[PDB]
Design a protein around this ligand. Structure first.
Ligand SMILES: Nc1nc2c([nH]c(=O)n2[C@H]2C[C@H](O)[C@@H](COP(=O)(O)O)O2)c(=O)[nH]1
Ligand SMILES: [Mn+2]
Length: 126
């Protein structure tokens, strides 16, 4: 299971975070909008499509900030963390999910999935 997520951050060094549903894997956890990279699709396409679907924006000139693999108690997933600094549209809860800007400095890794630990840390430096 390959996963593409977008680390969306504005000029104010804030990132746009969303909270996962109470009945989803890693429920109630904070997260970077993202989803499964589908067949016949590239990870770059997957992140654009996913952000469009989840927060209504289209990533532009983004880079791969981090790529890693994590083993959850019942599944193994590869995460593709894209740093998105330019985009069209305004990020919002397009799928009716909680969404808001969060200072990079005040992020608490414990709030996100354990898989994001290194990314969250590395983030506090760029
Ligand atoms: N969207 C998203 N999923 C994440 C993050 N970290 C992380 O482990 N995941 C995991 C949780 C899910 O098992 C999977 C995403 O699949 P869904 O979007 O279908 O929930 O990847 C993250 O920052 N964003
Ligand atoms: Mn998702």
């Amino acid at each position: 299971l390959q996963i593409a997520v977008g680390i969306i951050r504005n000029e104010n060094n804030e990132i746009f975070i969303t909270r996962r549903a109470a009945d989803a894997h890693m429920a109630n956890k904070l997260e970077f909008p993202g989803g499964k990279i589908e067949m016949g699709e590239t990870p770059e396409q997957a992140v654009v499509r996913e952000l469009q679907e989840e927060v209504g924006i289209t990533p532009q000139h983004f880079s791969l900030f981090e790529k890693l693999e994590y083993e959850f108690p019942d599944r193994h997933i590869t995460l593709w963390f894209w740093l998105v600094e330019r985009w069209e549209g305004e990020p919002w809860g397009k799928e009716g999910q909680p969404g808001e800007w969060m200072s990079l400095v005040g992020l608490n890794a414990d709030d996100f999935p354990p898989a994001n630990e290194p990314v969250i840390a590395k983030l506090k430096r760029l």
